[PDB]
């Protein structure tokens, strides 16, 4: 079966916990650490569990 893996665009680490996905870009996500450092805040994001 096919598996979806989310990798953080800031640090290339796996997104464990909350996923901050850009609503503008295709396929841009941040982990909570990179989100907390303020990456990519020129675009609205969705934060899902
Ligand atoms: Zn990260
Ligand atoms: Zn974006």
Numbering used by the authors: -3 to 45
Manuscript excerpt for this entry:
Intriguingly, the autophagy adapter p62/SQSTM1/Sequestosome-1 was recently reported to recognize N-degrons, the N-end rule substrates of the well-characterized UPS, and where ultimately these substrates are delivered to ALS8,9. p62 is a key selective autophagy adapter that plays a role in the degradation of various cellular constituents such as misfolded proteins and their aggregates, malfunctioning organelles, and invading pathogens. Intriguingly, it was recently reported that the central ZZ-domain in p62 plays a critical role in the recognition of N-terminal arginylated BiP/GRP78 by the Arg-tRNA transferase ATE1. Here, we present the high resolution structures of the ZZ-domain of p62 in complex with 8 different N-degrons including type-1 and type-2, and subsequently identify key determinants involved in the unusual recognition.
